[PDB]
């Protein structure tokens, strides 16, 4: 079903980084692959996710750039699920490169953190069977 | 001498970043303004650049992607300036990112470091009067 290096779970495919890229090369990569980075639907799909994590911050498809939060596929943000870690998002500034916080990402414990898009973190694509 | 928002000392202009980008970006945007990232040719050069610094990681114009350690513009790195932390460069490739270390930048106290050319971190363009 699912190519080589790509792990199948409840009619998706799942491929880790075993490197890191900035979000929008993350999301160029994913998208040469015919694939998005990883949408969480789902506590399941979060618990799947979260267990496979290599140890380290991980990009998932969700960023507010235009103020708003989106997932790259158009899943709704407002009524889908949601996995914050306490205090998330802030928009940060006070690491004073510029701007606020306007990509997310995995912590190992698999709780989301708003952080700057500029950032070498590892990625999750998934693509449809 | 200099244009506004430079700052002139002994035959350059310098430019402080108030922001963060990857390597690549930041020599790109020096190169836009007509110049590049910050060559340190002398220890009084050093102690000018470091005591200005913005109290965060910020990239200078010394980078090895091919091996061995080359200034942007050409100044001869062996018989050259070096200001390396104890234990620099390294190369280290346990930050898991992807390769090792290619990139070298300014801690605030002014020792260099090697680090990943993706981070984002602050950065000084010079130029000629
Ligand atoms: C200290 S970094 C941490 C908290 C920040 C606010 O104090 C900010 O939200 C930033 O996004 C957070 N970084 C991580 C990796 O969670
Ligand atoms: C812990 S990060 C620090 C030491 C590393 C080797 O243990 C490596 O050289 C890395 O380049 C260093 N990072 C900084 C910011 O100096
Ligand atoms: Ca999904
Ligand atoms: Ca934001
Ligand atoms: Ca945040
Ligand atoms: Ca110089
Ligand atoms: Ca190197
Ligand atoms: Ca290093
Ligand atoms: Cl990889
Ligand atoms: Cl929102
Ligand atoms: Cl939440
Ligand atoms: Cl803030
Ligand atoms: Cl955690
Ligand atoms: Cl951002
Ligand atoms: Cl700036
Ligand atoms: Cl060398
Ligand atoms: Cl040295
Ligand atoms: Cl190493
Ligand atoms: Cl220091
Ligand atoms: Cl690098
Ligand atoms: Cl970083």
């Given amino acids: ?3 080589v290096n790509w792990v199948e779970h409840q ?3 799942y491929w880790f980084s075993h490197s890191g890229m900035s979000w929008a090369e ?3 990569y994913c998208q040469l692959k015919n694939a998005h980075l990883v949408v969480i639907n789902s506590r399941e799909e979060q618990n799947f996710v979260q267990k496979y994590l290599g140890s380290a ?3 998932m498809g969700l960023s507010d750039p235009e103020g708003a939060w989106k997932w790259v596929d158009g899943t709704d ?3 889908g699920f949601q996995n914050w870690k306490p205090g998330q998002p802030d928009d940060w500034q006070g690491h004073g490169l510029g701007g606020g916080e306007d ?3 995995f912590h190992p414990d698999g709780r989301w953190n708003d952080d ?3 950032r ?3 990625w999750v694509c998934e693509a449809g069977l």
């Fill in 116 to 118: 700057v898009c500029q």
């Fill in 77 to 79: 943000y407002a009524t």
């Fill in 26 to 28: 993350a999301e160029k």
């Fill in 103 to 105: 990509c997310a990402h």
């Fill in 1 to 3: 079903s699912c190519p």
């Fill in 57 to 59: 911050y991980t990009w």
């Fill in 120 to 122: 070498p973190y590892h």
């Fill in 11 to 13: 009619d998706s495919c």
